[PDB]
């Protein structure tokens, strides 16, 4: 917020992967009658 805010992009992405993946997984899995396992 004051400095080295660039690294934040590397840290946020390092998690957004395991996050967005799960989020979209649960949603699609609950929205789709034939989830993909």
Closest CA to 24 of 36, 12, 14: 36
Q: For residue 31, count other CB atoms closer than 10 A to its CB.
A: 8
Nearest to 21 by CA among 32, 13, 31: 13
How was it solved? NMR
Overall residue count recorded for the chain in this entry: 37
In whole angstroms, give the CA distance from residue 21 to residue 23. 6
Q: What distance in Å separates the CA atoms of residue 29 and residue 17, rounded to the nearest whole number?
A: 17
């Amino acid at each position: 917020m004051i400095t080295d805010v660039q690294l934040a992009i590397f840290a946020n992405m390092l998690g957004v992967s395991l996050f967005l993946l799960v989020v979209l997984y649960h949603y699609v899995a609950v929205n789709n009658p034939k989830k993909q396992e």
